Design a protein around this ligand. Structure first.
Ligand SMILES: [Cl-]
Ligand SMILES: [Cl-]
Ligand SMILES: [Yb+3]
Ligand SMILES: [Yb+3]
Ligand SMILES: [Yb+3]
Length: 129
């Protein structure tokens, strides 16, 4: 599923990401924009042999199981395919664990490089919330 901006903001709010670990909704929408372009089916292979999955590009080394990533810990206890679903619940549940792991949203390199410090409120402009 390719979400619209405000559609994704609404879904993230419904699943309790708004201000989760102190990160406002626009931070999450911005992260998703640059990780996946709002596409739940996004997959990308990393240089270390792991793969990133879904709207927030969650990796298969630490977080989910894809069966082809040696050293897989699967800390979200979920097949990586579950992170590609049109329903964002599994991605949100796993993102909550990731952002709680110590470094906040810096876990997402794209967030650090493209969202952090910017006017992230723009990502929720005009949305009914
Ligand atoms: Cl915001
Ligand atoms: Cl933090
Ligand atoms: Yb990646
Ligand atoms: Yb559902
Ligand atoms: Yb409201």
């Amino acid at each position: 599923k390719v979400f619209g901006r405000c559609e994704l903001a609404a879904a993230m709010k419904r699943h309790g990401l708004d201000n989760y670990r102190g990160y406002s909704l626009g931070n999450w929408v911005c992260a998703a924009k640059f990780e996946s372009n709002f596409n739940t089916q996004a997959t990308n292979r990393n240089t270390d042999g792991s793969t990133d999955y879904g709207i927030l590009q969650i990796n298969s080394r630490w977080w989910c199981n894809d069966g082809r990533t040696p050293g897989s810990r699967n800390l979200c206890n979920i097949p990586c395919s579950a992170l590609l679903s049109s329903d964002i619940t599994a991605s949100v549940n796993c993102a909550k664990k990731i952002v709680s792991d110590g470094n906040g949203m810096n876990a997402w390199v794209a967030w650090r490089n493209r969202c952090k410090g910017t006017d992230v409120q723009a990502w929720i402009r005009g949305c009914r919330l």
